[PDB]
Amino acid sequence: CQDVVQDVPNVDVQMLELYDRMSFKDIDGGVWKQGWNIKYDPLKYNAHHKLKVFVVPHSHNDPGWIQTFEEYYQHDTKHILSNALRHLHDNPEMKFIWAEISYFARFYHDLGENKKLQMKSIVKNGQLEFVTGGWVMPDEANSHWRNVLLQLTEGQTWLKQFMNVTPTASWAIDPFGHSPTMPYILQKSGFKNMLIQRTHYSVKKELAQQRQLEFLWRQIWDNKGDTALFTHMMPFYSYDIPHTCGPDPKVCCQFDFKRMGSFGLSCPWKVPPRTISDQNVAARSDLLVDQWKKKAELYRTNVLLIPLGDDFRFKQNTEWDVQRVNYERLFEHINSQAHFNVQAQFGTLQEYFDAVHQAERAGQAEFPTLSGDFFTYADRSDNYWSGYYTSRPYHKRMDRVLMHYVRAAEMLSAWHSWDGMARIEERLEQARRELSLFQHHDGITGTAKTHVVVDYEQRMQEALKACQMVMQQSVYRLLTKPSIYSPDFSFSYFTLDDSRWPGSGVEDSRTTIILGLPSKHVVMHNTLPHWREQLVDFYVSSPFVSVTDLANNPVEAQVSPVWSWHHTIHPQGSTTKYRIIFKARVPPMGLATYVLTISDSKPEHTSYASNLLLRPTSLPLGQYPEDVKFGDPREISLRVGNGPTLAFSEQGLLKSIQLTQDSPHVPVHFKFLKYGVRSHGDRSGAYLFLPNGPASPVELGQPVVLVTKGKLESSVSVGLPSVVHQTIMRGGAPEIRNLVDIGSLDNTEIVMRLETHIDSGDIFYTDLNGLQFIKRRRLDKLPLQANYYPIPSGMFIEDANTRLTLLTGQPLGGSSLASGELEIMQDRRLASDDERGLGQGVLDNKPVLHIYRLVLEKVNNCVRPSELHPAGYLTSAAHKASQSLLDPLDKFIFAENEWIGAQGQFGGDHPSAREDLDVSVMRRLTKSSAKTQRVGYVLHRTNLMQCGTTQKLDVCHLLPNVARCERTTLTFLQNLEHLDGMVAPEVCPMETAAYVSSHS
């Protein structure tokens, strides 16, 4: 295993370094506004050395944006694919590439048999070529790597099953900036090439100048380079025809033949396209070939990629005709005229990449190496696209909930074969597909029209219900004696209980366990492959409850009141229901059963939290044994167990953390601020963050502070404008919860900021797709919005001695705008459109419960990478805190009065793997009729910082009667290695591997 800490990789282009050097000057470069006047030597190409040009027709199909998936399917995409089937069938030299398998599967299953066979034949002969073959073209900023893999697997599994093809070339023309997580997953899924478009105009210019727009993209930690994936960056402003023929859109627009008469479209540069004739073909070819030869100067081979398409193009029969016939006339003239020294034809993306690598192996070119990312994107001037890192934060949070629910449903149901009557495979397919669809670059991004967001939400709501049904049927089968297990596959044996989605302040939909019915069975699931202990809570009808395991051993517990906030923002207690809080111990990938039992009076093993209200009136709590205390606002300090001591201001916001008894009170201040929108010039919208100066403090007033002090759990909640802010303490890193209701504060963005004396300077770390931490440098030469980066799961600052890490349960935008600071946007409400085509601002805000862990640590005794290393790594504590947010224990309440044949535990004999190893995916790949059953596992090993302080996991033996163990691509679709003694080796730090076990 490569060291990923001490050795820095050697790359030609390191994007953090490039950022340090680049001036980012927004110079007017002429007809190529963000470039220069390209020159070429006409003697460069001759009859020996010709320019080979591939014109690659395409149609950008958004699975939701202005319309819903179904609306676009019915009114646009259905007609595009029908016309493609017909026109490619009838025109054997014509070509077309297709990216979104969500739409293609929708279309193919509607076809009659005749058309299905016609479709298979134009795919088999390479006319219609799938590019990437994901369910969608995902967002790369907010998307979790697990969901990027999920949506890739959904699409390619469909393509393999139905078209017998697996794409090896990726096409990503629309995501708003690009992540190295994509080459990471693609290269481990059999890919050989990828293409990207939306990078910063200054980066296009800088790389174009060095012919570095094609590069071997490797991970920031990868010394050896085996992660490398060949990447083509397109050089110009857009993927549309005006910005794909060459540097001058006024010329290129004349070669988009849909922009003439009968179609009702036009060229903004005022020169229309003309039909190619014998009279004008020499003149028109002169202009077009000159554009091609200019574009070719930016690349290292004599093979040129010319995309030909735009948003939902190739819809009409007549569009196919006018583009095809005019280009054929141009090709026929250009190829016949030796003076051009060009061979031009319709081609596909893999045809382009194959020809580029042939040129490379002929000795024509050697490609530069590159590491880093392409955030934050700007398309023009100061228009940085950091807005969508936060836009529609409710659905951003919902994404991470559904991610966990799909993993837990696939894992819990994987243990057994199910009868088709159970509809397990149907429910899991539905859940995978709705979560996969939401990875779209107008889904999780929050860049779709209000009604489309509603469609996404309802699809994810149904996916969540499907996951619950699979999980509760699985738990019933796993913990019921086989002698009794007699399933009704339509019955609810358990109801799920989820404290954090949507949150009791958002949807007051937790079931109260009603005891009098004296006892109630609850079950916890642990999707992680190590033993876990975690506090769990349930709502109960009475404060007089005690906890046992199934063997009747008592379990220490705490009872707190149920609290809700009301607009003055004041708490009110429940007289009716109470929280029972206790520590569940759950095996790796297993289940643990506990029992809640009522009694006459205070039980022996259950304690009662005190409650202090700081502002008064009086708050009855019914049967709750301890009266609520009142006091004037004052500073307060709390410690739970052996854990940190936290001090809070009189506004109830953190001000210091003391790690240990004999350690300093380290300053750590939470503050809420607000950004506005410009009165003059460009307005913030769903995409763009265009602040009118630094954030100004929120006016807190004199707020009400509720302090709940318990043996197992304490918390400080405060009712601020737009935010009920809560700090919860269970004995380790505190948990922060913000109930964010931006209400009708138009043109406002609410930020949460941490202020410390950590001497971070201009350095900070943010993650990419929950997979890796990348070093960021704040640049005062760039505007504030350019220093905003995606925070998909975490961010940290460190000096030589001290680190602060903020872990998130949701992707939000964030930065460190000054030494010692972290900040992260909570929500944003924008009255205006930002002119990228969405045609609305963001005024559909709803209450969302944002969750975090705050980890203050000493790192002076940690082995940290070189100061030249472009990566950072979490500690054990920060990693486990992330895992607690993204993959908590699942909680199940037995629905019925009696559970005959209940068992106490499943998975007690499961191996407890090292803390840096995860079973990201467990998925049964076969239905019950397969005589050979197959189960797929994805194994991810992270890299933790070593600071001073388990059984081997062989996934192929987790199930019995194992006949074969194969290492596969991450999609499970290609066998890479038949494994020795059917033992799945453990993987290197920052490596992800997939394995399929086969069983008798």
Ligand SMILES: OC[C@@H]1NCC=C[C@H]1O
């Ligand atoms: O995905 C549809 C849109 N294409 C142009 C710009 C941004 C995207 O939302």
Ligand SMILES: [Zn+2]
């Ligand atoms: Zn798009």
